[PDB]
Design a protein around this ligand. Structure first.
Ligand SMILES: CCCCCCCCCCC[C@@H](O)CC(=O)O[C@@H]1[C@@H](N)[C@@H](OP(=O)(O)OP(=O)(O)OC[C@H]2O[C@@H](n3ccc(=O)[nH]c3=O)[C@H](O)[C@@H]2O)O[C@H](CO)[C@H]1O
Ligand SMILES: CCCCCCCCCCC[C@@H](O)CC(=O)O[C@@H]1[C@@H](N)[C@@H](OP(=O)(O)OP(=O)(O)OC[C@H]2O[C@@H](n3ccc(=O)[nH]c3=O)[C@H](O)[C@@H]2O)O[C@H](CO)[C@H]1O
Ligand SMILES: [Zn+2]
Ligand SMILES: [Zn+2]
Ligand SMILES: [Zn+2]
Ligand SMILES: [Zn+2]
Lengths: 327, 301, 323, 302
């Protein structure tokens, strides 16, 4: 522009330059305006915020932190500056300072940033677990749970550390809490809950929990596990009723695959076998191709549970995809 | 004759490595005349140095990544090299305390900003260019790179990504290399990746630090970045930026015509090694390239 | 430069949407007497782009008509005029602009010329003026021999007139022109092979199309005819073969339907019934035609893709999704 | 006394109708004092004058569309009405030779440009204003609109599209109406529409002329436009633009506070009809809003 006046015109020109990617000119303009000796305190704070955003958009992160730490103490820009600092400390993989800034923000009123505190603590515990130190990982998990008590990641990490320590009873105690903490993520604990119950040997209680999970609409994983245990418990053909019943309420590709396999196991051969082969080779050829987890904020689809969705960088958004497509 | 350039002030910058995700505190430091760009790792108690030689590049899965005999790596040196080649820096000690040059915004503009803020000096010594004498060409199937004799440095890159988001933009860009031309045209194109293969690359230990803030993320059919493309055909421009960076690995500004087609980070280094292996294809010369003096022209209403 | 200071602020203002200011800046610059010829032409082009962005097509046309005689800007001005004439449903001039562009080198506009002629024929069709519709379609075919729309439209016109031999002769050309769109002809083609009376040739052509991986529609039609000919057993065998060779959800549903007819009553049959109730709903809910340049999925064939506004880039979705 | 306004020159503009896709030739013309905005179909035998009146609206599918007794229609008069309300035009004759007002860029900026280019002449007569004596309100389930007494013209709009691409933006807007405020804050908001509901809408006969150049095509998870949003929250801004356009259908600028939640064209027209029905709830007044004064800006030469 440059015909819109002054100071504010400089700010708009710098914003345009940052958007167009001409980072050097954006910093030059904003810094020239900031160094002006004729600016008021409000305008200086605006310039510092714009310069910090410029550095953050240019990737120079420590300079962004330097230009944003001067706005936290200012009432007008406190929340925005703390949010930008939280983003910087997330991106630069410094979880402790990110936790401190998130605690500042939650103290300021924004209570949505407690899940993020739990996730930062879980990430720190993962870093410690990578070095084979279960006590500190447990301490950090406890602190994160105290920060937020509605996070499935904290419970899953607690189960993992308990299984590492061998306190399998406590592992089950922590994992089963995810049923009440978050239903959509129940399927993530079954792979480990099975091992926990096997080590404990409470097979009857394992079956009871699987029955409760399937009755609670946990996903196809619970149904498949329950059917697998039932087949050995009371035969296949006689006990095929349960899979058929669960099928009708919540049909899913991963479920009918098992029913087709059961039909194949005991069939009359002939043309019917050829059919039930060519099919059951196709439902099973798109049971593994389809993505299993989706982010419910930006549409990202992945085959593994990304706690920190790469696209939108939002914590605890990727959840299993439900309905004729997966879990 | 063109004079060797270095920096006037040690300049730091803390970014996040694209292919590692670590926090790297890059530090560019001046060096005396006749030293060549030397990379260095600082976190290692004994400081380890990589002289800029084409043979150093040993892993090029997705980024020209130096590796010495003991498997100590400095990856993603293809953008900082691009900025240094654009500004024609001949002696500089680059230090990284983690095994990756930061990515900044994906492009090479932040590195140009850092270098210009440092201030580029002009040592009282001749600048060695590596001028080609005989055509040398190397192919990797459909991909092919070629160096030809010429009175300057001219790039003619090409791209054939079979993708609807990249096929609507000019798949060819040619320029006569020069500091101002580089800073104006190529020094802002960002690294571009596909959101289809980010779940896979991150599983393979690559693109861990990537995000919308440091890459152009073209989905199955269109570019997802909110801002959009900085240019209209940014993809080929960034491919040529990577080409310049990779060609700078020889340690000196090259003189010739570099024409490439679907050339990656491995093909460029293979071409450079082949050119340097032939003693009758290249020679050290002085003062044969176009001006490398940035022009402070922009001064509008 | 001073002039380039304008035409960059104006571009910014147009991008921000303040057309009232971008047009004002460009018009004031144009009215200045200090502009050189080349600078004046650049200003005219920028003002025309401003008008076109703001949606005042009658003024964008007027501005761009001043550049068609300048060698440097001829391509851009003619392309913008083509876009304007496409947008404001005026084909008889879009064809002229496209033909000028073809004469000036761009040979990829023959497809769009054929499509403009087809659209004109469509306008004359539905008003019972089939003679002129056929004339226009013949002109379009002359302007491009690799357009499927021309062949399909000529088939429709012949069918309306009643000449079915020529209808089939023209429709069969789609295989040589564009294989991907053969599935469009089949339906129509079927009629012209039934009331014409050549059922054996119909079956032979269906077999050839299936062997050429024509698509799921051809496979289903071939399966139905094989059923009606040689009982359900041979049809099921053939469908199983094609499913193994080419997997498609529609053929999967056909196989389920044929299985149901041959199955002893039991709860397994009810499970298959519910599986059908789900899979048929899914196949009836999935999109059929997708664009190959902007990822637009429509349930019916669009020749002019609404999103990217590119002609003949919507083709049937191939794979496990639909056809 | 504010004084009535009109145009100085017959100003034309061609365009593509949004909901019919037919070439249209909008022709704004001046009128004398005390005429009111009268729309006119010109391709018909004689013409078909539609005197702007809330009762004329009889089709509000996706465009406040006038329909007289003979089914002759002029659809998509929301944005042109919004522009006229922004510039406070009380006497102007709108002629379209095709059955819909053009769409331009999906906003009122082109119409503001056309009207300013024509020039806003001021006539020698007071400007009639509809002042809202008593609070009135209408509801359509979870959507509602409410007129309240006020010494001015203020709008307060809220939206909730439960859509991942619109919830991220500001979902509440509010302003005190004024020519400059409208020209600067609302005249540029585009005709936001979803990509999923285009095959269906085009099948039904609507949005036949809409394209990326005249709308914010929002797909399932993000805005598909290359340029992006003109304003960070232009969805609600455009919704309020449509609200202004619908409320101007009464023919005169309204004085009051209009607060709306998830309001559409049908709801706005219903609210206006309800207000105009209660003889005691509205009255004719003058000199209540500070319109006009569209301040210019510097024109440097460099
Ligand atoms: C949720 C979102 C999070 C953020 C994610 C966004 C991205 C940020 C992360 C970093 C990603 C980077 O890594 C950048 C990135 O992905 O871009 C690399 C790029 N450098 C280059 O890589 P490379 O030279 O090694 O070639 P490939 O063999 O791998 O390419 C395979 C095939 O491409 C053809 N081909 C290859 C090379 C060439 O010159 N021309 C050409 O046509 C040829 O047919 C070949 O067979 O090519 C590809 C082009 O973007 C990518 O791979
Ligand atoms: C592929 C290439 C594409 C090229 C370009 C395509 C686009 C072209 C531009 C025109 C597109 C049109 O399609 C117009 C268009 O999309 O905008 C209309 C918009 N005015 C409004 O609808 P509107 O008020 O007119 O009328 P309804 O009677 O239908 O409103 C009541 C219904 O809407 C819900 N509702 C309504 C209002 C609100 O605040 N919240 C909310 O939830 C309510 O819950 C109920 O379901 O709501 C929708 C929001 O975009 C659209 O229908
Ligand atoms: Zn996400
Ligand atoms: Zn690169
Ligand atoms: Zn398309
Ligand atoms: Zn509207």
């Amino acid at each position: 522009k440059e015909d819109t006046g002054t100071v504010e015109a400089h700010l708009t020109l710098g914003n345009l330059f940052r958007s167009r990617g001409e980072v050097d000119r954006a910093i030059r303009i904003h810094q020239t305006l900031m160094e002006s000796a004729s600016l008021t305190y409000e305008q200086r704070l605006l310039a510092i915020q714009q310069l910090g955003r410029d550095y953050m958009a240019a990737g120079l992160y420590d300079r962004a932190e330097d230009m944003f730490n001067q706005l936290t103490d200012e009432t007008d820009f406190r929340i925005g500056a703390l949010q930008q600092l939280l983003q910087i400390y997330q991106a630069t993989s410094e979880w402790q300072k990110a936790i401190d800034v998130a605690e500042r923000l939650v103290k300021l009123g924004k209570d949505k940033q407690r899940v993020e505190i739990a996730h930062f603590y879980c990430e720190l515990a993962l870093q410690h677990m990578a070095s084979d130190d279960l006590d500190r990982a447990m301490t950090l998990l406890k602190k994160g749970a105290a920060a937020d008590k509605n996070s499935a990641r904290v419970s899953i990490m607690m189960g993992r550390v308990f299984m590492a320590k061998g306190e399998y009873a406590k592992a089950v105690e922590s994992l089963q809490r995810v049923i009440s903490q978050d239903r959509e993520l129940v399927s993530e604990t079954l792979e480990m809950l099975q091992t926990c119950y096997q080590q404990l040997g409470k097979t009857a209680e394992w079956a009871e929990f699987l029955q409760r999970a399937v009755e609670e609409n946990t996903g196809a994983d619970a149904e498949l596990m329950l059917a697998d245990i039932i087949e050995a418990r009371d035969g296949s053909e006689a006990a095929q009723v349960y899979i058929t019943r669960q099928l009708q309420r919540h049909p899913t590709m991963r479920v009918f695959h098992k029913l087709m396999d059961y039909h194949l196991n005991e069939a009359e051969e002939g043309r019917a076998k050829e059919s039930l082969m060519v099919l059951r080779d196709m439902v099973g050829e798109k049971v593994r191709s389809k993505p299993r987890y989706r982010c419910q904020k930006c549409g990202f689809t992945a085959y593994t549970l990304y706690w920190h969705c790469p696209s939108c960088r939002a914590w605890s958004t990727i959840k299993p995809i439900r309905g004729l497509d997966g879990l | 004759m063109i004079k060797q350039r270095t920096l006037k002030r040690i300049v730091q910058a803390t970014g996040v490595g694209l292919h590692t995700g670590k926090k790297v505190t890059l530090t560019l430091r001046p060096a005396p005349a006749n030293t060549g760009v030397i990379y260095r790792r600082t976190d290692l108690n004994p400081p380890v140095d990589f002289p800029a030689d084409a043979k150093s590049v040993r892993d090029t899965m997705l980024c020209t990544c130096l590796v010495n005999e003991h498997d100590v790596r400095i990856s993603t040196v293809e953008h900082l090299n691009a900025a240094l080649a654009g500004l024609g820096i001949d002696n500089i000690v680059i230090e990284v305390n983690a095994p990756e040059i930061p990515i900044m915004d994906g492009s090479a503009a932040p590195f140009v900003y850092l270098l210009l803020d440092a201030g580029i000096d002009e040592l009282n010594c001749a600048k060695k260019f590596v001028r080609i004498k005989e055509t040398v060409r190397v192919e990797d199937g459909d991909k092919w790179a070629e160096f030809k004799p010429y009175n300057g440095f001219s790039l003619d890159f090409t791209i054939d990504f079979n993708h609807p988001a990249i096929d609507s933009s000019n798949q060819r860009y040619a320029m006569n290399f020069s500091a101002d031309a580089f800073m104006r045209q190529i020094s802002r194109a960002r690294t571009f990746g596909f959101m289809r293969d980010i779940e896979y690359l991150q599983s393979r230990g690559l693109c861990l630090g990537g995000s919308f803030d440091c890459a152009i993320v073209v989905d199955d059919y269109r570019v997802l970045n909110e801002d959009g493309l900085r240019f209209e055909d940014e993809f080929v421009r960034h491919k040529m930026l990577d080409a310049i960076g990779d060609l700078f690995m020889c340690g000196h500004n090259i003189i010739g015509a570099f024409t490439a087609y679907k050339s990656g980070h491995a093909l460029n280094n293979k071409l450079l090694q082949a050119v340097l292996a032939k003693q009758e294809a290249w020679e050290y010369v002085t003062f044969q390239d176009d001006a490398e003096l940035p022009l402070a022209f922009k001064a509008p209403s």
